[PDB]
Ligand binder design. Structure first.
Ligand SMILES: *[B]([O])([O])C1=[C][C]=[C][C]=[C]1
Length: 570
């Protein structure tokens, strides 16, 4: 049995009061507490909970749960600006919880997405009472995920889509109903119905609606393309290695935060009890069912199993039950292809063979019907594949790690974009034996451009016997950020550069009858904004002042372009 207290006002260091809801068990004395920091209304528990845990079970089992409205939203006072106030607000909320009569000195956290990012922001405070966190589909470096990326390109669909979602929330919670609210609601809906079209406006920085409702969209995100001091100020990643806080980390292979979610596991595993669970989900699709790819009912987000695991995790760290995690694996991955859940002892997998698969083939590799090949052997002849990248006609984003723009079809069939001359395809011969690729994926390409800046993309694909070319993982490298995301430099026209493309991670068994395929291009819109091919401030440029670029991929003995695949042999 339990009770629920609504709108308990918690004072922050500056006097601003944040509203919390208290779910407290009918107990004799103090109990362990779990905190959730939410920017989408603490009252609306059903909206996020289905992507997390059946957490009322925690309350029925003796835990107190506190759900808070973040600063400036809904029942909370103050002004809302994403990320900047969460470290301090979390520290003050954790301190308040610890001071209460119903708290036994043990606090934990759980939640998904922004409710996951806020946990990393709470973890770096150094509050002794915080014994464990459980961040799902989260990031500890906001530049790397979800706003930009390891390649330095703006995740424009993520930005405009989320800003429009928050804009809808900021309006239905402010001081009195304004006459322009009705018109603004329709305009925000127009952005959510066509994020690609909203991202196609030039200059990208000119956002009349979003820039008015939430200035941060331009002031912080669009205006800061480099991983500068403004981003480092809200980044938690470098402080993660110094922590000794247990973390139950959940991720999804097609989730926009996957690269960063996995990196947080690697950062905390040595100093504390870190756990990892990765399924085949995208941010908005946790069903395991997609348009052209079904992973089976076992792939559907196992909410009750997740609840049991979280309870066992919290029982060990908040209650002191030393044997609570007995039989529970360190890492649990959904291996695609064979479509089965598998227990592992570590991430990256102990037996990982980082194997180069070289780009080769006779003739031009343009289109799926070209001569592009992939092999573990170095190509014998020096060749080059050339194409024209026009910002007015970018390669459309199809699946992958899309968040808001068609973000419910991660393992998308790539056939609709196969006819494009700007999509270079490289494939292995039809496999006779299974090849498992589980781990971080990257590419090393020898490239040249006619422009002083451009982008280069790489996408890993599983070609099915029936024709389906299913996307797995992808990445991008904006040339000015080839060596560093902090201090960019331009490239010289015609000169060959060896660049690295971070393609995040995947777990897939390429079964017999299938082919391993890699797509190389210079755009992936709106997953990433279009490079202007000018070397200018991309988001401030007009479409008419943008240039086309004649891009080239070099392959052979002296230029061994390849994709590094994390091969597991069992
Ligand atoms: B999550 O809360 O669903 C989220 C947060 C920031 C950007 C995209 C998604």
């Amino acid at each position: 049995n339990y009770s629920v207290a609504s709108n308990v006002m918690v004072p922050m260091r500056d006097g601003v009061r944040l509203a919390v809801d208290l779910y407290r068990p009918d107990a004799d004395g103090p109990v362990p507490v779990l905190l959730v920091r939410n920017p989408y209304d603490k009252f609306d528990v059903f909206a996020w909970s289905t992507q997390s845990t059946n957490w009322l079970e925690f309350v029925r089992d003796g835990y107190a749960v506190v759900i808070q409205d973040t600063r400036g939203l809904f029942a909370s006072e103050g002004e809302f600006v994403p990320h900047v106030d969460d470290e301090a607000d979390a520290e003050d909320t954790l301190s308040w919880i610890l001071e209460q009569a119903w708290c036994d000195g043990n606090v934990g956290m759980f939640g998904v997405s922004y409710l996951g990012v806020t946990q990393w922001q709470a973890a770096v405070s150094g509050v002794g009472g915080l014994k464990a966190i459980a961040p799902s589909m989260a990031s500890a470096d906001l530049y790397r995920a979800p706003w930009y990326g390891p390649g330095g390109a703006l995740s424009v669909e993520a930005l405009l889509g989320w800003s429009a979602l928050i804009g809808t929330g900021l309006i239905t919670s402010r001081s009195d109903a304004r006459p322009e609210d009705a018109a603004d609601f329709v305009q925000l809906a127009a952005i959510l119905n066509d994020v690609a079209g909203a991202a196609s406006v030039t200059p990208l920085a000119e956002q009349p609606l979003l820039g008015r409702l939430i200035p941060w969209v331009i002031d912080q995100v669009v205006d800061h393309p480099d991983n500068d001091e403004s981003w480092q100020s809200i980044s938690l990643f470098e402080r993660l290695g110094g922590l000794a806080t247990p973390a139950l980390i959940t991720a999804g292979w097609y989730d926009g935060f996957v690269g960063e979610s996995l990196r947080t596991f690697v950062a905390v595993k040595d100093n504390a009890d870190a756990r990892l669970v990765v399924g085949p989900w995208s941010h908005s699709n946790l069903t395991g069912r997609n348009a052209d790819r079904k992973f089976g009912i076992a792939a559907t987000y196992p909410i009750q199993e997740a609840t049991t695991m979280h309870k066992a995790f919290f029982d060990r760290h908040l209650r002191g039950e030393t044997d609570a995690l007995a039989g529970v694996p360190k890492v649990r991955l959904f291996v695609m292809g064979i479509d089965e859940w598998r227990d592992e002892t570590d991430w990256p997998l102990p037996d990982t063979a980082y194997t180069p698969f070289y780009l080769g083939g006779s003739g031009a590799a343009n289109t799926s019907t070209g001569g592009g090949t992939l092999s573990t052997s170095i190509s014998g002849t020096e060749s080059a594949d050339t194409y024209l990248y026009d910002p007015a006609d970018p390669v459309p984003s199809l699946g992958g790690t899309l968040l808001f723009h068609n973000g419910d079809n991660g393992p998308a069939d790539q056939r609709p974009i196969h006819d494009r001359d700007d999509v270079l395809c490289y494939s292995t011969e039809v496999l006779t034996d299974p090849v498992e690729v589980t781990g971080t994926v990257s590419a090393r390409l020898f490239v040249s451009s006619s422009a002083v800046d451009t982008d280069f993309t790489a996408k890993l694909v599983d070609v099915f016997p029936d024709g389906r070319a299913i996307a797995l993982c992808d990445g991008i490298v904006r040339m000015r950020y080839r060596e560093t995301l902090v201090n960019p430099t331009l490239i010289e026209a015609g000169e060959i550069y060896e660049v690295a493309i971070d393609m995040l991670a995947t777990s897939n068994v390429f079964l017999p009858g299938h082919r391993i395929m890699v797509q190389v291009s210079s755009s992936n819109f709106p997953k990433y904004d279009r490079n202007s091919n000018t070397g200018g401030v991309i988001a401030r440029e007009q479409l008419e002042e943008m240039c086309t670029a004649v891009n080239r991929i070099h392959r052979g003995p002296e230029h061994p372009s390849h994709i590094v695949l994390p091969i597991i042999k069992r």
